[PDB]
mmCIF file with all atom_site columns, C-alpha atoms in Angstrom:
data_model
loop_
_atom_site.group_PDB
_atom_site.id
_atom_site.type_symbol
_atom_site.label_atom_id
_atom_site.label_alt_id
_atom_site.label_comp_id
_atom_site.label_asym_id
_atom_site.label_entity_id
_atom_site.label_seq_id
_atom_site.pdbx_PDB_ins_code
_atom_site.Cartn_x
_atom_site.Cartn_y
_atom_site.Cartn_z
_atom_site.occupancy
_atom_site.B_iso_or_equiv
_atom_site.pdbx_formal_charge
_atom_site.auth_seq_id
_atom_site.auth_comp_id
_atom_site.auth_asym_id
_atom_site.auth_atom_id
_atom_site.pdbx_PDB_model_num
ATOM 1   C CA . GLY D 1 1   ? 0.067  -0.157 0.050   1.00 26.33 ? 4   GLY D CA 1
ATOM 2   C CA . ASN D 1 2   ? 0.973  3.576  0.269   1.00 22.27 ? 5   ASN D CA 1
ATOM 3   C CA . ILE D 1 3   ? 4.178  4.101  2.725   1.00 25.18 ? 6   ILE D CA 1
ATOM 4   C CA . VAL D 1 4   ? 3.981  7.830  2.816   1.00 24.61 ? 7   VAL D CA 1
ATOM 5   C CA . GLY D 1 5   ? 3.139  9.265  6.279   1.00 24.80 ? 8   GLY D CA 1
ATOM 6   C CA . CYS D 1 6   ? 4.237  5.738  7.863   1.00 23.06 ? 9   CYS D CA 1
ATOM 7   C CA . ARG D 1 7   ? 6.741  4.612  10.238  1.00 25.92 ? 10  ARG D CA 1
ATOM 8   C CA . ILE D 1 8   ? 9.043  2.141  8.471   1.00 26.65 ? 11  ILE D CA 1
ATOM 9   C CA . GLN D 1 9   ? 12.055 0.104  9.405   1.00 21.53 ? 12  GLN D CA 1
ATOM 10  C CA . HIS D 1 10  ? 14.565 -1.787 7.292   1.00 25.16 ? 13  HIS D CA 1
ATOM 11  C CA . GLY D 1 11  ? 17.912 -3.166 7.051   1.00 24.69 ? 14  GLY D CA 1
ATOM 12  C CA . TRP D 1 12  ? 20.875 -1.328 5.582   1.00 27.97 ? 15  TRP D CA 1
ATOM 13  C CA . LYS D 1 13  ? 24.052 -2.364 4.499   1.00 26.86 ? 16  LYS D CA 1
ATOM 14  C CA . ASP D 1 14  ? 26.439 -0.299 2.347   1.00 28.24 ? 17  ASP D CA 1
ATOM 15  C CA . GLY D 1 15  ? 29.282 -2.332 0.718   1.00 29.41 ? 18  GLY D CA 1
ATOM 16  C CA . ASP D 1 16  ? 31.169 -4.390 3.319   1.00 31.97 ? 19  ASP D CA 1
ATOM 17  C CA . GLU D 1 17  ? 30.155 -2.613 6.508   1.00 31.76 ? 20  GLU D CA 1
ATOM 18  C CA . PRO D 1 18  ? 27.944 -4.628 9.161   1.00 27.90 ? 21  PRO D CA 1
ATOM 19  C CA . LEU D 1 19  ? 24.099 -4.552 8.600   1.00 26.40 ? 22  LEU D CA 1
ATOM 20  C CA . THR D 1 20  ? 22.226 -1.858 10.611  1.00 30.40 ? 23  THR D CA 1
ATOM 21  C CA . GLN D 1 21  ? 18.769 -1.502 11.406  1.00 31.99 ? 24  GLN D CA 1
ATOM 22  C CA . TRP D 1 22  ? 17.124 1.837  10.361  1.00 35.26 ? 25  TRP D CA 1
ATOM 23  C CA . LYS D 1 23  ? 13.738 3.252  11.603  1.00 35.13 ? 26  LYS D CA 1
ATOM 24  C CA . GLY D 1 24  ? 12.178 6.420  10.442  1.00 36.66 ? 27  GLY D CA 1
ATOM 25  C CA . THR D 1 25  ? 9.166  8.106  9.131   1.00 36.43 ? 28  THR D CA 1
ATOM 26  C CA . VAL D 1 26  ? 8.255  8.531  5.594   1.00 35.32 ? 29  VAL D CA 1
ATOM 27  C CA . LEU D 1 27  ? 7.553  12.241 4.777   1.00 32.38 ? 30  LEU D CA 1
ATOM 28  C CA . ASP D 1 28  ? 6.966  12.144 1.023   1.00 32.96 ? 31  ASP D CA 1
ATOM 29  C CA . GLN D 1 29  ? 7.087  10.361 -2.355  1.00 29.43 ? 32  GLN D CA 1
ATOM 30  C CA . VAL D 1 30  ? 8.672  12.532 -4.991  1.00 31.44 ? 33  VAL D CA 1
ATOM 31  C CA . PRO D 1 31  ? 6.324  13.391 -7.930  1.00 33.49 ? 34  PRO D CA 1
ATOM 32  C CA . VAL D 1 32  ? 9.130  13.773 -10.559 1.00 30.25 ? 35  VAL D CA 1
ATOM 33  C CA . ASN D 1 33  ? 10.378 10.302 -9.339  1.00 31.79 ? 36  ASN D CA 1
ATOM 34  C CA . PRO D 1 34  ? 7.851  8.095  -7.732  1.00 33.00 ? 37  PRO D CA 1
ATOM 35  C CA . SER D 1 35  ? 10.528 5.746  -6.699  1.00 35.36 ? 38  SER D CA 1
ATOM 36  C CA . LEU D 1 36  ? 12.297 8.179  -4.671  1.00 34.32 ? 39  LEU D CA 1
ATOM 37  C CA . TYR D 1 37  ? 11.008 8.964  -0.961  1.00 36.70 ? 40  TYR D CA 1
ATOM 38  C CA . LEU D 1 38  ? 12.117 11.464 1.472   1.00 34.71 ? 41  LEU D CA 1
ATOM 39  C CA . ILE D 1 39  ? 12.341 10.050 4.949   1.00 34.01 ? 42  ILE D CA 1
ATOM 40  C CA . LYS D 1 40  ? 13.171 11.431 8.474   1.00 32.90 ? 43  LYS D CA 1
ATOM 41  C CA . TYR D 1 41  ? 15.181 8.509  10.229  1.00 33.46 ? 44  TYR D CA 1
ATOM 42  C CA . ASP D 1 42  ? 15.229 8.534  14.038  1.00 35.06 ? 45  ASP D CA 1
ATOM 43  C CA . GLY D 1 43  ? 18.373 10.367 15.564  1.00 31.76 ? 46  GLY D CA 1
ATOM 44  C CA . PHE D 1 44  ? 19.344 11.349 11.796  1.00 33.80 ? 47  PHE D CA 1
ATOM 45  C CA . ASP D 1 45  ? 19.607 15.192 11.520  1.00 29.82 ? 48  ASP D CA 1
ATOM 46  C CA . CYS D 1 46  ? 19.304 15.230 7.757   1.00 30.42 ? 49  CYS D CA 1
ATOM 47  C CA . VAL D 1 47  ? 16.477 14.242 5.495   1.00 31.33 ? 50  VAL D CA 1
ATOM 48  C CA . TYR D 1 48  ? 17.360 11.321 3.111   1.00 31.61 ? 51  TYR D CA 1
ATOM 49  C CA . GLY D 1 49  ? 16.252 10.546 -0.241  1.00 27.51 ? 52  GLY D CA 1
ATOM 50  C CA . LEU D 1 50  ? 16.163 6.852  -0.912  1.00 28.58 ? 53  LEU D CA 1
ATOM 51  C CA . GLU D 1 51  ? 14.725 4.645  -3.613  1.00 27.98 ? 54  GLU D CA 1
ATOM 52  C CA . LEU D 1 52  ? 13.344 2.576  -0.876  1.00 30.16 ? 55  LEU D CA 1
ATOM 53  C CA . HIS D 1 53  ? 12.122 -0.430 -3.150  1.00 32.66 ? 56  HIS D CA 1
ATOM 54  C CA . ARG D 1 54  ? 15.017 -0.220 -5.444  1.00 34.95 ? 57  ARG D CA 1
ATOM 55  C CA . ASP D 1 55  ? 17.879 0.387  -3.431  1.00 36.33 ? 58  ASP D CA 1
ATOM 56  C CA . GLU D 1 56  ? 20.201 -2.785 -2.928  1.00 35.39 ? 59  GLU D CA 1
ATOM 57  C CA . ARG D 1 57  ? 21.390 -1.574 0.340   1.00 32.08 ? 60  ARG D CA 1
ATOM 58  C CA . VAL D 1 58  ? 17.872 -1.562 1.747   1.00 31.57 ? 61  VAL D CA 1
ATOM 59  C CA . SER D 1 59  ? 16.604 -4.880 2.892   1.00 31.88 ? 62  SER D CA 1
ATOM 60  C CA . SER D 1 60  ? 13.491 -6.445 4.968   1.00 30.98 ? 63  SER D CA 1
ATOM 61  C CA . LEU D 1 61  ? 11.429 -3.148 4.437   1.00 28.07 ? 64  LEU D CA 1
ATOM 62  C CA . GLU D 1 62  ? 8.229  -3.038 6.545   1.00 30.02 ? 65  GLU D CA 1
ATOM 63  C CA . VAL D 1 63  ? 5.634  -0.294 7.644   1.00 24.60 ? 66  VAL D CA 1
ATOM 64  C CA . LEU D 1 64  ? 5.349  -0.442 11.384  1.00 23.33 ? 67  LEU D CA 1
ATOM 65  C CA . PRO D 1 65  ? 2.076  -0.883 13.451  1.00 23.37 ? 68  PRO D CA 1
ATOM 66  C CA . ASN D 1 66  ? 3.442  2.093  15.368  1.00 23.99 ? 69  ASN D CA 1
ATOM 67  C CA . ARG D 1 67  ? 1.969  5.713  14.694  1.00 20.39 ? 70  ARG D CA 1
ATOM 68  C CA . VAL D 1 68  ? 3.529  8.869  13.781  1.00 19.37 ? 71  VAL D CA 1
ATOM 69  C CA . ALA D 1 69  ? 3.538  11.113 16.891  1.00 19.45 ? 72  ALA D CA 1
ATOM 70  C CA . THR D 1 70  ? 0.932  27.920 14.873  1.00 18.88 ? 79  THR D CA 1
ATOM 71  C CA . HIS D 1 71  ? 1.624  31.723 14.833  1.00 13.26 ? 80  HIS D CA 1
ATOM 72  C CA . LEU D 1 72  ? 5.369  31.351 15.724  1.00 13.57 ? 81  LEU D CA 1
ATOM 73  C CA . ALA D 1 73  ? 5.553  28.343 13.102  1.00 15.72 ? 82  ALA D CA 1
ATOM 74  C CA . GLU D 1 74  ? 4.002  30.751 10.454  1.00 13.18 ? 83  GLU D CA 1
ATOM 75  C CA . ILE D 1 75  ? 6.497  33.435 11.299  1.00 16.15 ? 84  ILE D CA 1
ATOM 76  C CA . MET D 1 76  ? 9.618  31.276 11.060  1.00 17.01 ? 85  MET D CA 1
ATOM 77  C CA . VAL D 1 77  ? 9.089  29.781 7.713   1.00 17.11 ? 86  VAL D CA 1
ATOM 78  C CA . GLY D 1 78  ? 11.115 31.650 5.049   1.00 15.72 ? 87  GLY D CA 1
ATOM 79  C CA . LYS D 1 79  ? 13.204 33.398 7.769   1.00 17.35 ? 88  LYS D CA 1
ATOM 80  C CA . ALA D 1 80  ? 16.872 33.592 7.747   1.00 18.45 ? 89  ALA D CA 1
ATOM 81  C CA . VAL D 1 81  ? 17.919 32.490 11.106  1.00 17.74 ? 90  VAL D CA 1
ATOM 82  C CA . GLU D 1 82  ? 20.835 31.863 13.569  1.00 18.67 ? 91  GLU D CA 1
ATOM 83  C CA . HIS D 1 83  ? 20.855 28.337 15.022  1.00 22.05 ? 92  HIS D CA 1
ATOM 84  C CA . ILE D 1 84  ? 22.744 27.256 18.105  1.00 20.88 ? 93  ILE D CA 1
ATOM 85  C CA . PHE D 1 85  ? 22.534 23.341 17.888  1.00 17.88 ? 94  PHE D CA 1
ATOM 86  C CA . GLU D 1 86  ? 24.502 20.146 18.657  1.00 20.78 ? 95  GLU D CA 1
ATOM 87  C CA . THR D 1 87  ? 25.109 17.510 15.818  1.00 18.56 ? 96  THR D CA 1
ATOM 88  C CA . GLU D 1 88  ? 25.073 13.880 15.946  1.00 18.24 ? 97  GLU D CA 1
ATOM 89  C CA . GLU D 1 89  ? 28.725 13.771 16.307  1.00 17.76 ? 98  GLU D CA 1
ATOM 90  C CA . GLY D 1 90  ? 28.769 16.199 19.179  1.00 19.53 ? 99  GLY D CA 1
ATOM 91  C CA . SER D 1 91  ? 30.047 19.262 17.204  1.00 17.77 ? 100 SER D CA 1
ATOM 92  C CA . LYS D 1 92  ? 28.642 22.584 18.749  1.00 17.48 ? 101 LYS D CA 1
ATOM 93  C CA . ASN D 1 93  ? 27.560 24.797 16.025  1.00 18.42 ? 102 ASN D CA 1
ATOM 94  C CA . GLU D 1 94  ? 26.282 28.453 15.986  1.00 20.16 ? 103 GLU D CA 1
ATOM 95  C CA . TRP D 1 95  ? 25.156 28.619 12.037  1.00 19.72 ? 104 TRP D CA 1
ATOM 96  C CA . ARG D 1 96  ? 23.323 30.890 9.857   1.00 21.55 ? 105 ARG D CA 1
ATOM 97  C CA . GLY D 1 97  ? 20.623 29.265 7.993   1.00 23.12 ? 106 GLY D CA 1
ATOM 98  C CA . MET D 1 98  ? 17.092 29.583 6.582   1.00 22.49 ? 107 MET D CA 1
ATOM 99  C CA . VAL D 1 99  ? 13.761 27.827 7.601   1.00 21.31 ? 108 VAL D CA 1
ATOM 100 C CA . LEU D 1 100 ? 12.515 26.185 4.435   1.00 20.20 ? 109 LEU D CA 1
ATOM 101 C CA . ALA D 1 101 ? 9.043  24.943 5.636   1.00 19.79 ? 110 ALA D CA 1
ATOM 102 C CA . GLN D 1 102 ? 7.167  23.044 8.292   1.00 19.32 ? 111 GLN D CA 1
ATOM 103 C CA . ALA D 1 103 ? 7.827  19.337 7.530   1.00 16.62 ? 112 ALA D CA 1
ATOM 104 C CA . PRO D 1 104 ? 5.150  17.138 5.960   1.00 14.31 ? 113 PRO D CA 1
ATOM 105 C CA . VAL D 1 105 ? 4.011  14.511 8.286   1.00 14.86 ? 114 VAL D CA 1
ATOM 106 C CA . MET D 1 106 ? 5.797  15.257 11.395  1.00 14.41 ? 115 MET D CA 1
ATOM 107 C CA . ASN D 1 107 ? 4.132  18.371 12.707  1.00 14.70 ? 116 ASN D CA 1
ATOM 108 C CA . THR D 1 108 ? 6.407  20.085 15.269  1.00 12.89 ? 117 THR D CA 1
ATOM 109 C CA . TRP D 1 109 ? 9.379  19.585 12.633  1.00 11.65 ? 118 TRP D CA 1
ATOM 110 C CA . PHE D 1 110 ? 10.920 22.009 10.441  1.00 17.74 ? 119 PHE D CA 1
ATOM 111 C CA . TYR D 1 111 ? 12.810 21.818 7.068   1.00 15.64 ? 120 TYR D CA 1
ATOM 112 C CA . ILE D 1 112 ? 16.044 23.984 7.843   1.00 15.51 ? 121 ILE D CA 1
ATOM 113 C CA . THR D 1 113 ? 19.280 24.615 5.731   1.00 16.05 ? 122 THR D CA 1
ATOM 114 C CA . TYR D 1 114 ? 22.545 26.075 6.475   1.00 12.48 ? 123 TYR D CA 1
ATOM 115 C CA . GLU D 1 115 ? 24.980 28.392 4.423   1.00 13.46 ? 124 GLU D CA 1
ATOM 116 C CA . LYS D 1 116 ? 27.861 26.093 5.861   1.00 11.43 ? 125 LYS D CA 1
ATOM 117 C CA . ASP D 1 117 ? 26.187 22.938 5.109   1.00 8.18  ? 126 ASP D CA 1
ATOM 118 C CA . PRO D 1 118 ? 23.407 23.389 2.397   1.00 3.62  ? 127 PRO D CA 1
ATOM 119 C CA . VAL D 1 119 ? 21.626 20.070 2.802   1.00 3.59  ? 128 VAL D CA 1
ATOM 120 C CA . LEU D 1 120 ? 18.124 19.681 4.159   1.00 2.26  ? 129 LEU D CA 1
ATOM 121 C CA . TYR D 1 121 ? 17.951 19.388 7.870   1.00 2.00  ? 130 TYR D CA 1
ATOM 122 C CA . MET D 1 122 ? 15.051 18.743 10.055  1.00 3.81  ? 131 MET D CA 1
ATOM 123 C CA . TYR D 1 123 ? 14.560 19.794 13.629  1.00 2.00  ? 132 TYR D CA 1
ATOM 124 C CA . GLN D 1 124 ? 12.101 20.779 16.396  1.00 2.00  ? 133 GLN D CA 1
ATOM 125 C CA . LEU D 1 125 ? 12.519 24.569 15.995  1.00 2.00  ? 134 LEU D CA 1
ATOM 126 C CA . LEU D 1 126 ? 9.941  25.885 18.220  1.00 2.00  ? 135 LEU D CA 1
ATOM 127 C CA . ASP D 1 127 ? 11.584 24.052 21.124  1.00 2.00  ? 136 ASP D CA 1
ATOM 128 C CA . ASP D 1 128 ? 15.069 25.373 20.355  1.00 2.00  ? 137 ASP D CA 1
ATOM 129 C CA . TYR D 1 129 ? 13.375 28.796 20.010  1.00 2.00  ? 138 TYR D CA 1
ATOM 130 C CA . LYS D 1 130 ? 11.924 28.631 23.621  1.00 2.00  ? 139 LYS D CA 1
ATOM 131 C CA . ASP D 1 131 ? 15.509 27.278 24.702  1.00 2.00  ? 140 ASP D CA 1
ATOM 132 C CA . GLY D 1 132 ? 16.625 30.521 23.525  1.00 2.00  ? 141 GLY D CA 1
ATOM 133 C CA . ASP D 1 133 ? 19.016 28.662 20.784  1.00 2.00  ? 142 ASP D CA 1
ATOM 134 C CA . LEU D 1 134 ? 17.302 30.208 17.646  1.00 2.00  ? 143 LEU D CA 1
ATOM 135 C CA . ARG D 1 135 ? 17.328 33.796 16.545  1.00 2.00  ? 144 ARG D CA 1
ATOM 136 C CA . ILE D 1 136 ? 14.926 35.002 13.631  1.00 2.04  ? 145 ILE D CA 1
ATOM 137 C CA . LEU D 1 137 ? 16.907 37.515 11.459  1.00 2.59  ? 146 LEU D CA 1
ATOM 138 C CA . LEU D 1 138 ? 12.616 23.637 -13.177 1.00 2.00  ? 166 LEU D CA 1
ATOM 139 C CA . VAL D 1 139 ? 11.481 20.793 -11.024 1.00 2.00  ? 167 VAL D CA 1
ATOM 140 C CA . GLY D 1 140 ? 12.066 17.550 -12.806 1.00 2.00  ? 168 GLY D CA 1
ATOM 141 C CA . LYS D 1 141 ? 15.033 18.737 -14.904 1.00 2.00  ? 169 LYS D CA 1
ATOM 142 C CA . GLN D 1 142 ? 18.446 17.146 -14.737 1.00 2.00  ? 170 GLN D CA 1
ATOM 143 C CA . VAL D 1 143 ? 21.503 19.255 -13.303 1.00 2.00  ? 171 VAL D CA 1
ATOM 144 C CA . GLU D 1 144 ? 25.036 19.092 -13.027 1.00 2.00  ? 172 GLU D CA 1
ATOM 145 C CA . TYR D 1 145 ? 28.290 20.833 -11.666 1.00 2.00  ? 173 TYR D CA 1
ATOM 146 C CA . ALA D 1 146 ? 32.052 20.256 -12.038 1.00 2.00  ? 174 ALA D CA 1
ATOM 147 C CA . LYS D 1 147 ? 33.634 18.896 -8.902  1.00 2.00  ? 175 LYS D CA 1
ATOM 148 C CA . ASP D 1 148 ? 37.410 19.508 -7.837  1.00 2.00  ? 176 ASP D CA 1
ATOM 149 C CA . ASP D 1 149 ? 38.302 15.803 -8.927  1.00 2.00  ? 177 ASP D CA 1
ATOM 150 C CA . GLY D 1 150 ? 37.653 16.653 -12.547 1.00 2.00  ? 178 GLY D CA 1
ATOM 151 C CA . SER D 1 151 ? 34.117 14.732 -12.691 1.00 2.00  ? 179 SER D CA 1
ATOM 152 C CA . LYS D 1 152 ? 30.736 15.887 -13.005 1.00 2.00  ? 180 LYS D CA 1
ATOM 153 C CA . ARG D 1 153 ? 28.131 15.457 -10.340 1.00 2.00  ? 181 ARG D CA 1
ATOM 154 C CA . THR D 1 154 ? 24.622 14.820 -11.709 1.00 2.00  ? 182 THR D CA 1
ATOM 155 C CA . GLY D 1 155 ? 21.350 15.086 -10.134 1.00 2.00  ? 183 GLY D CA 1
ATOM 156 C CA . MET D 1 156 ? 17.574 16.028 -10.681 1.00 2.00  ? 184 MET D CA 1
ATOM 157 C CA . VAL D 1 157 ? 15.669 19.016 -9.249  1.00 2.00  ? 185 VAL D CA 1
ATOM 158 C CA . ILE D 1 158 ? 12.996 17.402 -7.263  1.00 2.00  ? 186 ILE D CA 1
ATOM 159 C CA . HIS D 1 159 ? 11.313 20.237 -5.195  1.00 2.00  ? 187 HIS D CA 1
ATOM 160 C CA . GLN D 1 160 ? 10.650 24.040 -5.351  1.00 2.00  ? 188 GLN D CA 1
ATOM 161 C CA . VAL D 1 161 ? 10.188 25.779 -1.872  1.00 2.00  ? 189 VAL D CA 1
ATOM 162 C CA . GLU D 1 162 ? 6.895  27.402 -1.538  1.00 2.00  ? 190 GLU D CA 1
ATOM 163 C CA . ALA D 1 163 ? 8.035  30.096 0.839   1.00 2.00  ? 191 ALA D CA 1
ATOM 164 C CA . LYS D 1 164 ? 11.163 30.962 -1.247  1.00 2.89  ? 192 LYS D CA 1
ATOM 165 C CA . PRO D 1 165 ? 10.324 30.133 -5.089  1.00 2.00  ? 193 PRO D CA 1
ATOM 166 C CA . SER D 1 166 ? 13.951 30.626 -6.032  1.00 2.00  ? 194 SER D CA 1
ATOM 167 C CA . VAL D 1 167 ? 14.978 27.853 -3.376  1.00 2.53  ? 195 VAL D CA 1
ATOM 168 C CA . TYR D 1 168 ? 15.018 24.174 -4.904  1.00 5.32  ? 196 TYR D CA 1
ATOM 169 C CA . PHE D 1 169 ? 15.842 20.813 -3.712  1.00 5.48  ? 197 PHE D CA 1
ATOM 170 C CA . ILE D 1 170 ? 18.046 18.674 -5.697  1.00 2.00  ? 198 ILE D CA 1
ATOM 171 C CA . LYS D 1 171 ? 18.741 14.771 -5.531  1.00 2.00  ? 199 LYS D CA 1
ATOM 172 C CA . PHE D 1 172 ? 22.348 13.926 -6.952  1.00 2.50  ? 200 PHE D CA 1
ATOM 173 C CA . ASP D 1 173 ? 22.863 10.414 -8.068  1.00 8.03  ? 201 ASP D CA 1
ATOM 174 C CA . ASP D 1 174 ? 25.817 9.583  -5.758  1.00 10.12 ? 202 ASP D CA 1
ATOM 175 C CA . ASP D 1 175 ? 24.109 10.580 -2.612  1.00 11.57 ? 203 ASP D CA 1
ATOM 176 C CA . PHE D 1 176 ? 20.993 10.433 -0.174  1.00 9.37  ? 204 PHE D CA 1
ATOM 177 C CA . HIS D 1 177 ? 21.241 13.809 1.184   1.00 8.15  ? 205 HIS D CA 1
ATOM 178 C CA . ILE D 1 178 ? 18.984 16.468 -0.129  1.00 5.53  ? 206 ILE D CA 1
ATOM 179 C CA . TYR D 1 179 ? 20.925 19.366 -1.390  1.00 6.81  ? 207 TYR D CA 1
ATOM 180 C CA . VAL D 1 180 ? 19.434 23.034 -1.152  1.00 5.31  ? 208 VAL D CA 1
ATOM 181 C CA . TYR D 1 181 ? 20.300 25.602 -3.841  1.00 3.43  ? 209 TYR D CA 1
ATOM 182 C CA . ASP D 1 182 ? 18.908 29.247 -3.719  1.00 2.01  ? 210 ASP D CA 1
ATOM 183 C CA . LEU D 1 183 ? 19.136 30.145 -7.424  1.00 4.13  ? 211 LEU D CA 1
ATOM 184 C CA . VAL D 1 184 ? 19.123 34.093 -6.802  1.00 4.93  ? 212 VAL D CA 1
ATOM 185 C CA . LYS D 1 185 ? 22.460 33.459 -4.880  1.00 3.03  ? 213 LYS D CA 1
ATOM 186 C CA . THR D 1 186 ? 25.818 33.138 -6.381  1.00 4.39  ? 214 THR D CA 1
ATOM 187 C CA . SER D 1 187 ? 25.483 29.398 -6.768  1.00 3.80  ? 215 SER D CA 1
ATOM 188 C CA . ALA D 1 188 ? 25.768 29.827 -10.709 1.00 5.14  ? 216 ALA D CA 1
ATOM 189 C CA . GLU D 1 189 ? 28.045 26.852 -11.368 1.00 6.04  ? 217 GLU D CA 1
ATOM 190 C CA . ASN D 1 190 ? 24.847 24.827 -11.800 1.00 6.78  ? 218 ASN D CA 1
ATOM 191 C CA . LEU D 1 191 ? 24.023 23.934 -15.164 1.00 5.16  ? 219 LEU D CA 1
ATOM 192 C CA . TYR D 1 192 ? 20.290 22.895 -16.070 1.00 6.63  ? 220 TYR D CA 1
ATOM 193 C CA . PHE D 1 193 ? 19.291 20.997 -18.891 1.00 3.27  ? 221 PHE D CA 1
#
């Protein structure tokens, strides 16, 4: 059936690393690629894009019986912010970013990205705000850019941010992170076909 908005679990094994068990919440199935899902995994800071039925690293995929658990939220969406947060690896950051959107499915979570790490993160920002840790200040087309190792990175534009229509989400073929590009900004080494 339809796994969007569902709790899921599956095995993960990339290459010769030991098999791990991943558990997460499916946020969305990408319209321009219905094989591609966006998932918030438990304890993972970044939103992942995985072809959950096609990826050979994914095994034993199941939906779980378990269920998925305003004025300030409305204000934050689209704002440039300064976020004081601690990452999975213990690094203590004070970073400038932007709040992209309230996340689908998980209703106190927000899509957020940072100028130092322009991928899609997801955090409970209204809690960080109360803690005093947050300060408020093409889709479907292929894309590429040249990397420093003399090769092209290739991907597809998968989402246009409603709060900021010049901001797009890009899925690259080589990676499960979701890359966030604001096209008005000097990020002009992107080529769209």
